[PDB]
């Protein structure tokens, strides 16, 4: 009656640690990851501080190896003073977070692709034109890119058109975008709807369905922020999501909307191969694909305790996660405790390959 | 000095047994295979007898279990008899072979892509308008197809034009089909240089590097025959392959042809998720890249004892192969005996997930 499913691979989750544990830390985050068939994160840098320079890189990856709970990589992030200084650090990272919504200038956008390591990952979070800005930026350093989070029928075919002329550019689409809409921001409210990119049009997300061959990766944008804050005077985007996305898809794929490979290329071996993540020995996901339920106020594990998903029937759950040889989860309670998650980059087989 | 690659994949090798041992076996293909910097190969059906019912394929496993030194999936043949009959056994296969180049009637491709299971792989030899004919025969179907050996820049372009329409194709190219052509069949010989599908124009390599981004996979082709047959008054068709395939493509690395990474993709992780192949633990190749030799008359493990690059200068060479935390491969001995390798499909980790 189960599916046996690999490890799944989220390349987009901001766990707040350091800094901002109030909203999730390493260990309430991994988790919700494992709650969602989740056995890899890639964790972003936007932290207090943020991941921007090697001391801060240190601390982040103690914290990390201290408490997560599954595996993961983190992110470096570009900024207005480090091009060029994250030499001898960047091959220890999940890649280099390019945040174009801290740099200002197209010219610091070419200097750190110039600088960083030309066979190590840069994502960009870059929206509507500023997909085409960055695309450029790429061509000229002749190297490649991945475009965090489309959400517009725009950025898909203009993504669309650069791959069509064989430019070295990927993409990851997250489930809000492909299961929420405008229709959905009378329900949600301007303070719970805020994030970044924003909900898009019905047009924006059938565009989306309709490009899903343009669509590399999955990933969820878990951005945890506590209900008080987004309810609150000054609400910061992102939505929750780690516990809700395998979920979302599975009803997506009873439905015929994608296949299951459809979904495996999307959620492990794409992320795999974009990022040359390693494999996890042992390690695999079992689903029931028959069970039906609805989204209720906030999912157990995330410290956000709210979803924009709330009152969404839902068909698939994940029943069983074993990650490296042990039960990390099963129906609703995670076993592997804080510190059993490890830094994949560490591994001989996690270091990315490059020319001596 | 040396340079860490994961362990490689070859999706499309002729073995020859049962039935052809005196041009190759398990043991001597898989051999040159972990010479070469191979550590998985995909053997296809076309031997005697041919792999094309249950008690055939129950035989070429034994074969390959009892035979083989580096890991394995084997391939069934498409016949005019076995459509709606494999679905047993279809799950235990690296996936579908159907040969276009005994099928005779789009009807009978029509039946093989209706009745094998709808998640399993199917490959097809498929030249020039062939590849547009089985294109279309996927989409009557509404699945996807991989298309073996593309040669020709007709054939590339029209996959380029399928994929900007977002059709499920992928395709593989052989490294004869991009260091070689015309211009050596006056020094290959009308015998030695049969292969099919052919050598290619300038014209035809030049337009396979230029679309390189529309290239999924490179397979060897390894279609061992001895010198006395392809010398012989009824050369049968194909170049050896396995020994050669990974120095050729360092040397193009070498020389910015393209980057160690679009190799890793097309060799190790494109092969993994469009076939569904498990990772391999504790595997792993060392290559130096700085050594130049040149090819000689024979490489050392393959029984053909003859190869179409001998005198091409290349520069990189395999100097060890790690098998599942054995010694497999140092510097031009084998050290794993045959039978060390496994039917990859009967791992866990190895069957292609479905729904239920
Ligand atoms: O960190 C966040 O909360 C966050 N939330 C968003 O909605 N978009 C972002 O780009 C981002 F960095
Ligand atoms: O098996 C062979 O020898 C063989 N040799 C080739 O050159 N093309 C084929 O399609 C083939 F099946
Ligand atoms: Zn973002
Ligand atoms: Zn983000
Ligand atoms: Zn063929
Ligand atoms: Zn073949």
Chains 1, 2 share one sequence.
Not at 185 to 211: F, I, M, T, Y
Not at 225 to 248: A, D, I, N, Q, Y
Not at 349 to 355: D, H, S
């Amino acid at each position: 009656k189960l599916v046996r499913l690999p490890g799944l691979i989220d390349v987009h989750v901001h766990l707040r640690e350091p800094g901002g544990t109030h909203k999730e830390d390493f260990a309430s985050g991994t988790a919700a990851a494992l709650a969602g068939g989740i056995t890899m994160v890639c964790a972003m840098p936007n932290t207090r501080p943020p991941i921007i320079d090697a001391p801060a890189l240190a601390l982040a990856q103690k914290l990390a190896e201290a408490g997560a709970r599954c595996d993961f990589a983190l992110f470096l992030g570009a900024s207005s003073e480090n091009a060029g200084t994250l030499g001898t650090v960047a091959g220890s990272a999940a890649g280099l977070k390019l945040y174009l919504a801290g740099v200002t200038s197209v010219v610091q956008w070419m200097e750190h692709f110039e600088t960083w390591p030309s066979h190590l990952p840069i994502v960009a979070h870059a929206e509507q034109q500023t997909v085409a800005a960055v695309l450029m930026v790429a061509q000229l350093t002749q190297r490649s890119v991945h475009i965090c989070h489309v959400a517009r029928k725009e950025e898909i075919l203009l993504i669309k058109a650069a791959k069509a002329r064989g430019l070295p550019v990927t993409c990851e689409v997250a489930p809000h975008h492909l299961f929420l809409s405008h229709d959905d921001l009378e329900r949600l409210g301007p303070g719970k709807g805020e994030v970044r990119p924003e909900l898009g049009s019905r047009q924006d997300v059938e565009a989306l369905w309709e490009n899903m061959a343009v669509i590399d990766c999955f990933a969820s944008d878990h951005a945890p922020h506590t209900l008080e804050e987004k309810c609150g005077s000054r609400p910061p985007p992102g939505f929750p999501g780690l516990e809700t996305m395998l979920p979302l898809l599975l009803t997506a794929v009873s439905e015929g909307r994608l296949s299951l490979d459809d979904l495996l290329q999307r959620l492990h071996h794409n992320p795999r191969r974009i990022f040359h993540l390693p494999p996890q020995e042992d390690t695999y996901v079992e689903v029931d694909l028959e069970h039906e339920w609805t989204i209720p106020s906030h999912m157990p594990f995330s410290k956000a305790h709210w979803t924009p998903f709330e009152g969404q029937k839902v068909k698939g759950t994940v029943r069983r996660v074993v990650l490296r040889g042990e039960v990390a989860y099963i129906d609703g309670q995670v076993l592997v405790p804080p510190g059993y998650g490890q830094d994949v980059r560490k591994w001989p087989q996690g270091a990315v390959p490059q020319l001596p």
